[PDB]
Amino acid sequence: DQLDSIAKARGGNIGDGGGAADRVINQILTEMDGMSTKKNVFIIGATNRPDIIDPAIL
Amino acid sequence: LSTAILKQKNRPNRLIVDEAINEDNSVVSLSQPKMDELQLFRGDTVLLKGKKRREAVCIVLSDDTCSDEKIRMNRVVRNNLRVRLGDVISIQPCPDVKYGKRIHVLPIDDTVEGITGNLFEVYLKPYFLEAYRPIRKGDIFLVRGGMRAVEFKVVETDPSPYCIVAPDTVIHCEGEPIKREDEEESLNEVGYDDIGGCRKQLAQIKEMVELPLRHPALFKEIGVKPPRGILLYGPPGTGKTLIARAVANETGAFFFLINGPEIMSKLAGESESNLRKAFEEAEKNAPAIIFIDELDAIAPKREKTHGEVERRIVSQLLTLMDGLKQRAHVIVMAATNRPNSIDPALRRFGRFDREVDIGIPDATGRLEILQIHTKNMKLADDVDLEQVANETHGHVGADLAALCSEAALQAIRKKMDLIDLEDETIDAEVMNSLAVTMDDFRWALSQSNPSALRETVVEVPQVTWEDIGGLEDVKRELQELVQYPVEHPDKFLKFGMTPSKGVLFYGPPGCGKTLLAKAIANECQANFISIKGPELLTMWFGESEANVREIFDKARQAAPCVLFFDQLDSIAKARGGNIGDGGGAADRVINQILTEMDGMSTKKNVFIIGATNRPDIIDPAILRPGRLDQLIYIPLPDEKSRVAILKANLRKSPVAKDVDLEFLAKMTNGFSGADLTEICQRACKLAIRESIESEIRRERERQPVPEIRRDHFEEAMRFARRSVSDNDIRKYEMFAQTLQQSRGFGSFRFPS
Amino acid sequence: AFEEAEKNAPAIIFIDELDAIAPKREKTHGEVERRIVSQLLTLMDGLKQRAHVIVMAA
Ligand SMILES: Nc1ncnc2c1ncn2[C@@H]1O[C@H](COP(=O)(O)OP(=O)(O)OP(=O)(O)O)[C@@H](O)[C@H]1O
Ligand SMILES: Nc1ncnc2c1ncn2[C@@H]1O[C@H](COP(=O)(O)OP(=O)(O)O)[C@@H](O)[C@H]1O
Numbered sequence: 077d078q079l080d081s082i083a084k085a086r087g088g089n090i091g092d093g094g095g096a097a098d099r100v101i102n103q104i105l106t107e108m109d110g111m112s113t114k115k116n117v118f119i120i121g122a123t124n125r126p127d128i129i130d131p132a133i134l
Numbered sequence: 135l136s137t138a139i140l141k142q143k144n145r146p147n148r149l150i151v152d153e154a155i156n157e158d159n160s161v162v163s164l165s166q167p168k169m170d171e172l173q174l175f176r177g178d179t180v181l182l183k184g185k186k187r188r189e190a191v192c193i194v195l196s197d198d199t200c201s202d203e204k205i206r207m208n209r210v211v212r213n214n215l216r217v218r219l220g221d222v223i224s225i226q227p228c229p230d231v232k233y234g235k236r237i238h239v240l241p242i243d244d245t246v247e248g249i250t251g252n253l254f255e256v257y258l259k260p261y262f263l264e265a266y267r268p269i270r271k272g273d274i275f276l277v278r279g280g281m282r283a284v285e286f287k288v289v290e291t292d293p294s295p296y297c298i299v300a301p302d303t304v305i306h307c308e309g310e311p312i313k314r315e316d317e318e319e320s321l322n323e324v325g326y327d328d329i330g331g332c333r334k335q336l337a338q339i340k341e342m343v344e345l346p347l348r349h350p351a352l353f354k355e356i357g358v359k360p361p362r363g364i365l366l367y368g369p370p371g372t373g374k375t376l377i378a379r380a381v382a383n384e385t386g387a388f389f390f391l392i393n394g395p396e397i398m399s400k401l402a403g404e405s406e407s408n409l410r411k412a413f414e415e416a417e418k419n420a421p422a423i424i425f426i427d428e429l430d431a432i433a434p435k436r437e438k439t440h441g442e443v444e445r446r447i448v449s450q451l452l453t454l455m456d457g458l459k460q461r462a463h464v465i466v467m468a469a470t471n472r473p474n475s476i477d478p479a480l481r482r483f484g485r486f487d488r489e490v491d492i493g494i495p496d497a498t499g500r501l502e503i504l505q506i507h508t509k510n511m512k513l514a515d516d517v518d519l520e521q522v523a524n525e526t527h528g529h530v531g532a533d534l535a536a537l538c539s540e541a542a543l544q545a546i547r548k549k550m551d552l553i554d555l556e557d558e559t560i561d562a563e564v565m566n567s568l569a570v571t572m573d574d575f576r577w578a579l580s581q582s583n584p585s586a587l588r589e590t591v592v593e594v595p596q597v598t599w600e601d602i603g604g605l606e607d608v609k610r611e612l613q614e615l616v617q618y619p620v621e622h623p624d625k626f627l628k629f630g631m632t633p634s635k636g637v638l639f640y641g642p643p644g645c646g647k648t649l650l651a652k653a654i655a656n657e658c659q660a661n662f663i664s665i666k667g668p669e670l671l672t673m674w675f676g677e678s679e680a681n682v683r684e685i686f687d688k689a690r691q692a693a694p695c696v697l698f699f700d701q702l703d704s705i706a707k708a709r710g711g712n713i714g715d716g717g718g719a720a721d722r723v724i725n726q727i728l729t730e731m732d733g734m735s736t737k738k739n740v741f742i743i744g745a746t747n748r749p750d751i752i753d754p755a756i757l758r759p760g761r762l763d764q765l766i767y768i769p770l771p772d773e774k775s776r777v778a779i780l781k782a783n784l785r786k787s788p789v790a791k792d793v794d795l796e797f798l799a800k801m802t803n804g805f806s807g808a809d810l811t812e813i814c815q816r817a818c819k820l821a822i823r824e825s826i827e828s829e830i831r832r833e834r835e836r837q838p839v840p841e842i843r844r845d846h847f848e849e850a851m852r853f854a855r856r857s858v859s860d861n862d863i864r865k866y867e868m869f870a871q872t873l874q875q876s877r878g879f880g881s882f883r884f885p886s
Numbered sequence: 887a888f889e890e891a892e893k894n895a896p897a898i899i900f901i902d903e904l905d906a907i908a909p910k911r912e913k914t915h916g917e918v919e920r921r922i923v924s925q926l927l928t929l930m931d932g933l934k935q936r937a938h939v940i941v942m943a944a
C-alpha cells in the first residue's frame with residue numbers, strides 16, 4: 077500500500093537519508109527479479125501517483 | 135460456542151447460599167421437595183463444596199420456609215466454604231464417616247489475645263458435648279463462652295479428613311498459636327472472581343488449563359493433547375499476572391513465578407542452568423503453572439541478538455518446551471508487552487501455541503474492577519461508582535486500585551484534623567464518624583494520572599461549550615460525531631453502516647478552531663490526544679514515520695479516542711513540493727498517515743480532527759471521504775454570533791446594565807473572536823489604576839466598582855484593531871466557494 | 887532486627903544507606919547482594935501491618 081513511498085526514480089536528491097532510500101529500491105529490485113528461482117509470490121502495489129515510481133520496478 | 139465454559143445450567147446438587155435462622159456450625163437446612171429429589175434423609179451427613187476447592191461437612195435437616203433452590207447455613211460454614219450470600223455450591227452425600235479417635239484444633243491468635251484460661255473446658259468441651267459434630271481438616275469454627283468467643287482451626291483428625299466428634303474422641307488444643315496474617319492471606323486469595331473485564335480471556339484460559347484436568351477421559355477418547363502454552367500480551371498493569379495467579383489458585387496447581395531480568399547472569403551457563411532448575415522444580419511440584427514475566431527481555435529474536443547469553447537462553451527455553459523428552463502435565467504461561475519482539479520459534483505450536491490479548495479495560499470492565507476493589511471498603515450513599523468509571527477514561531486496573539487507596543488516604547486526611555492526637559488511642563466517636571465520600575474520590579481523580587496514555591500527559595485548559603459563543607451548528611455536529619457511535623452502537627448496526635470519523639476545521643485565525651477542540655476534551659467520555667504539527671518529525675531516516683505509527687497505535691488501544699491535529703498543514707502537503715524536504719521524508723510521512731487513517735485494518739472508534747489555517751495546500755488524499763470527510767468552515771463571526779461571543783465572555787465578570795452589547799456587535803463588523811476578547815481584556819484592565827485609587831481613598835479617610843461601566847468600554851474600543859485583514863479573508867472565502875461549485879446540482883430534489 | 891521491631895510495637899525501622907545493602911540487582915557481580923535484595927523483598931512482603939510497624943530508609 078502506497079508503493080510510491082519506497083519506490084522512487086533514484087537520484088532525486090543529493091542527500092536522502094544517506095542514500096538509504098535509493099539502496100532500498102535496489103534491494104527490492106533483486107527480490108522481485110534476480111538470480112534465484114521464481115516462486116508463487118504475487119506482488120500487488122497500490123500507488124496514488126505512479127509517475128514518480130522507478131521505471132525498473134514497472 | 136467460545137463462551138461455553140462461562141455458562142451454567144441448573145442441577146439438583148446446585149443450591150443458592152441463603153441466610154440461616156437457627157442453624158449452628160454443624161447443620162444445614164434443605165427444603166423437603168429437593169431432599170426427596172436428592173434422596174436425602176433428615177440427620178444424614180453431607181459434603182459441601184465451595185470456591186477455591188474448599189470442602190465442608192454438615193448435617194442436613196428439613197426447613198419448610200426454605201426455597202427449593204436455596205440452602206440455609208450460618209456464617210461459619212460460609213467462611214469455611216469461602217462463599218457469600220447468593221453463591222452456588224454443590225451438595226452430595228458423605229457416607230462411611232467414622233467416629234473420630236483424636237482431633238487437634240488450634241485457636242486463632244486474635245481470638246485469644248488476653249485469654250489465659252483452659253481453652254478445652256471453657257470452649258471445646260461444651261461445644262462438642264454429646265453433639266456428634268462432623269468436622270473436616272482445615273475447618274474454622276467459632277465457639278461462644280467465657281469472656282470472648284474464640285475461633286479454632288482443625289489441623290489434625292483421626293480418621294482424616296472426615297470424622298465424627300464422638301464422646302470418646304480425644305480433643306486437645308495444645309500447639310503453636312495460629313498467625314492472623316497467614317489466615318488473612320488465604321482468605322484474600324486471588325480467585326477468578328477478582329478478575330474483572332476479561333470474561334472472554336478468562337473463558338479461553340479456563341478451557342485451556344482447567345478443562346483438561348477435570349475431564350481427561352474426554353481428551354483421551356477424542357485422541358488429542360491439550361495445548362501447553364499461554365502467551366498473554368497487553369499494556370503494563372492490565373492484570374496478566376493477576377489472571378495467572380487466579381488460575382493457579384482456583385485450579386489445584388502450584389504457582390511458580392519467573393522474572394526475566396533476574397534470570398540474566400553475567401557468568402556463562404548460569405542463566406539456562408537457572409531455567410532448568412526452575413523447570414525441574416515445577417515438574418516436582420506438579421500440578422504447577424510456570425509464569426515468566428517479561429518474556430521479551432529474556433527471549434529476544436536470535437538473529438537480531440548479538441549477545442551470546444540471550445541466544446543460548448532462547449535455545450534452552452526451546453529445548454525445555456519441546457525436544458526428544460516431552461514435558462507432561464506442565465503449563466507454561468508468559469506475559470510480554472510486545473509479543474512481536476519474541477523469537478518466532480517460540481511462537482510455534484507446542485510452545486506458547488496460543489496467544490491471548492488482555493486489552494485496556496472497558497467502561498463496564500473498569501466499573502467492575504472498581505466494584506471488586508471497593509467491596510472491602512465502606513461506601514456512602516452519595517458516591518456512585520459509575521461516575522468514577524466514566525471519569526476514568528484511560529485508567530487501568532492498577533490505576534484504579536491506586537485511586538481507591540489514595541481516596542481512602544484522603545478520607546484519613548479529612549479526619550486527621552478532628553483528633554487532637556495527644557491521646558495514644560482515638561475516642562470511639564471520631565472513630566465511627568470517619569467515612570468515605572464522593573469528594574475523596576473526586577480529589578483522587580484529580581490527583582491520579584492514567585498509565586495507558588503516562589507518556590501523553592498534558593494540562594487540561596478546562597473549556598466548556600458555554601465558553602464558546604456562536605457556532606451552534608458546529609457544536610451539535612461535534613457532539614453527535616463522538617457520542618453517537620459510542621452511546622448507540624446498536625443504531626448503526628441496525629442501519630448497517632459505520633459512522634463517520636473525520637473533521638477538518640479551516641478558517642481565519644482567532645475564530646475558535648482550537649477552542650472547539652479544547653471543549654471536546656472535557657464533555658466527551660473519550661480519550662483525547664493532541665499533536666502539535668511538526669512534533670512527529672525527526673532527523674533520522676525512518677523515525678518520522680515511526681512516530682506516526684506510534685500515535686495511531688496508541689489511539690487504537692485507547693479507543694474511543696479523539697486524535698486532534700493542530701496545524702495539520704505542517705505535516706500534510708500536496709506531495710512532491712521540493713527535493714530538499716529531508717530527501718523526501720516529508721512526502722514519506724504523508725504516505726504513512728494515509729495508511730493509518732484508511733488502510734487494510736479494521737476501523738476502531740478513533741476520531742481524527744484537524745485544525746488547519748491554510749487548507750488549500752493540504753493533500754487531496756487527506757481530504758478524501760473516509761479520512762477527513764466533513765470539512766467545516768469556521769468563518770469570522772457575524773452580528774448574531776458576536777453578541778453571543780460578547781455575552782459568553784461577560785457572564786463571569788459583573789457588568790453594568792447600562793452597557794449595550796448589541797451596539798458593540800454592530801460596529802465591530804470584521805473582528806474575530808480573539809479580537810473581541812482583546813476588547814474584553816482591555817475594558818477590564820482599564821480603570822484598574824482607579825481601582826487602587828478607590829482603595830487608597832479608603833486608607834486616606836481612615837488616617838473602583840464591581841460592575842464595569844459604559845465608560846470603560848468606550849476607552850477600550852479606541853485601542854481595538856482588526857487582526858484579520860480583508861486580503862486574508864478572501865483566501866478562505868475562495869476555498870469554501872470551490873467546494874460549493876464542485877458539487878453542483880444546487881437544491882437537489884428527487885423527481886416526483 | 888525485624889523480629890525485635892515487631893516485638894517492640896510500635897517500632898520504627900530505619901535502614902541507613904539502603905543503596906549500600908541493596909544496589910541495583912542487574913548491576914551486580916555477585917549472587918550475595920542479589921540474595922540480600924530477594925530476602926529483603928520477602929520480609930517487606932512479610933510485614934504484618936496489624937502490629938503497626940513500618941520501615942523507612944535514607
Ligand atoms: N467564538 C468564540 N467564542 C469565544 N471566544 C472565542 C471565540 N473565537 C475565539 N475566541 C477566543 O479567541 C482566543 C483564542 O482563539 P483560538 O486559539 O481558538 O483561535 P483559532 O481560530 O483556532 O486560531 P489559530 O488557528 O490562529 O490558532 C481565546 O481567548 C478565545 O476565547
Ligand atoms: N482485571 C482486573 N481486575 C481487578 N484488578 C486488576 C485487574 N487488572 C489489574 N488489576 C490490579 O492490578 C494490580 C496488579 O497489576 P499486575 O497484574 O501486577 O500488572 P501486570 O499485568 O502488568 O503484571 C492488582 O492489585 C490488581 O488489583
Ligand SMILES: [Mg+2]
Pocket residue numbers: 647648649745
Ligand atoms: Mg489554534
